[PDB]
Amino acid sequence: LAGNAARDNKKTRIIPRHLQLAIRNDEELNKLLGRVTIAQGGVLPNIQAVLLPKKTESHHKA
Amino acid sequence: EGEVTELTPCTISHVIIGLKTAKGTKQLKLDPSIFESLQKERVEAGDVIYIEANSGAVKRQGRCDTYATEFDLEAEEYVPLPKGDVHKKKEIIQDVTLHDLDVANARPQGGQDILSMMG
């Protein structure tokens, strides 16, 4: 799972990012490692594309 | 040919039918004897249909194009609106064989009581 995540992220060396992503993406590994926390890890992120079709800088003094 | 816009059946003395096309609309007194076929086709305001002046061969092509999506899901054809002149008078010089005529005159037509057995 970590190698799959790394290839998806276009990287060769597995890092805590990939391990965290793999553990929290799989249904059963997250159940097994729910209590566990990983150093230099992170939670699953959200996409910022939602900002574009709601509000952006206007032509005012652009 | 054209989108039938209205039917006004005048013991029917006659039924007026308005056919709409891209080039205009026209109202026709339509020989109430073929109101039977008109009802047989369930045609009403909105549908695009043919009708033959010789025999009354009314043929329902389906609903008009502009009436599509009236129900976001509905089993219909939605044939495009005809572009030519509703009054379609054109000559047919096609030929037929004599044996074809004989065959056409061999067996009867209709389902009077059980004669439907011919289909």
Partner: protein, 394 residues
């Protein structure tokens, strides 16, 4: 003779002397953060170097005068101090009005509309009547006509017979230039580059790139794929007023399909509004307004009882008004009305060269030909007759 002709459309006051003063003057005031306290009058907007974020103090609410103050100041400016002069007999001011009025809007005229600029034949007549008069002048052999006054607040369908307004069969579908501009604003904003603040420059997009599609579904099927001939990706540059003061659609050669314009301008327009907004006139109720289109109304004019008058009506369709000049509007109206009209009747549509000043030209022709000794209502008559003479003549 210093005669005068005036039109007071909600979008723009087309006024001036009868000596070809068709000059188009905006009929409202403006305010902006770049103009903290200066409330610019009708044409003073040109003094604004940065018209971004303008606020429109306009005296019109859905095509009807309201609050009477913007119009007051605009008139005191145009016809009072600078551009035109006020006089009891020189300025033969004729006024335009909506097709329906009441005692309060323009009939009650105590020192209002009867102020220092008077003359013998003050005319507050609908712009539709002036347009019909001009049409019959340039079309003498015609007996009747249907005027399509596609203005800012309405697109009125009004029949006429050389003088007579067929009030019984007139329609004013709620869709107008205001609704089109605001819908374009909202459509642009809730999809990209939220600029719905101003009825300004987006109004330019409303005029620069907007066009009526001959085949709406076909242009849509051409738009659903990127990089095609329809140019749905107009790529309209938004003016920042620091480098350019008016927007414009980039030439087809400068198109960047990825939207990554290295110039830094926000250009991510892909939607179909550029031809879906003009289509609101022909097939309303798509946005939500349960109303008929303008061809549907031109045909519902069949309600005109005399049958022999319908073939004369259908041959004199006049597509005036500011909104009538969209690329592809006249031919679309013609196509929509031709199929609905009987096959044996003749259809002839006419679009004035300048459908905005057409009413002003009709007023000019009214003034310079007749209506000085007859059809007259003077303040001297208003002082003696009050509201009676005004409603009697109009």
């Amino acid at each position: 003779m210093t005669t005068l002709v005036l039109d007071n459309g909600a979008y723009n006051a087309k006024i001036g002397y009868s000596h070809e003063n068709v000059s188009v003057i905006p009929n409202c005031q403006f305010r902006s953060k770049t103009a903290r306290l200066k409330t610019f009058t009708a044409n003073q907007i040109d003094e604004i170097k940065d018209p971004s974020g303008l606020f429109y103090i306009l005296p019109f609410q859905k095509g009807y005068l309201v609050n009477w103050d913007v119009q007051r100041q605009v008139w005191d400016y145009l016809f009072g101090k600078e551009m035109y002069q006020v006089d009891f007999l020189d300025t033969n001011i004729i006024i335009t009005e909506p097709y329906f009025n009441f005692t309060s809007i323009q009939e009650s005229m105590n020192e209002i509309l009867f102020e220092e600029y008077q003359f013998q034949a003050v005319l507050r007549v609908n712009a539709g009547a002036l347009s019909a008069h001009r049409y019959f002048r340039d079309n003498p052999s015609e007996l009747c006509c249907i005027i399509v006054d596609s203005g800012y607040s309405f697109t009125h369908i009004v029949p006429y017979c050389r003088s007579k307004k067929k009030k019984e069969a007139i329609i004013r579908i709620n869709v107008g230039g205001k609704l089109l501009t605001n819908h374009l604003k909202e459509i642009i904003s809730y999809r990209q580059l939220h600029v719905m603040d101003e009825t300004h420059v987006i109004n330019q997009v409303k005029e620069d790139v907007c066009y009526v599609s001959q085949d709406f579904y076909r242009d849509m099927d051409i738009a659903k794929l990127k990089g095609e001939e329809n140019t749905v990706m107009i790529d309209y540059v938004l003016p920042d007023f620091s480098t350019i003061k008016k927007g414009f659609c980039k030439p087809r050669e400068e198109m960047v399909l990825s939207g990554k314009y290295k110039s830094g301008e926000q250009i991510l327009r892909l939607a179909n509004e550029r031809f879906a907004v003009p289509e609101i006139l022909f097939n309303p109720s798509d946005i939500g307004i349960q109303e008929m289109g303008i061809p549907e109304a031109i045909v519902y004019s069949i309600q005109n009882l005399p049958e022999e008058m319908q073939p004369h009506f259908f041959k004199n369709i006049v597509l005036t008004g500011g909104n009538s000049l969209f690329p592809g509007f006249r031919d679309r109206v013609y196509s929509e009305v031709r199929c609905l009209t009987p096959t044996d009747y003749d259809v002839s549509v006419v679009l004035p060269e300048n459908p905005i000043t057409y009413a002003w030209e009709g007023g000019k022709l009214i003034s310079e030909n007749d209506d000085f000794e007859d059809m007259v209502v003077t303040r001297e008559d208003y002082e003696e007759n009050g509201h009676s003479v005004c409603e009697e003549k109009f």
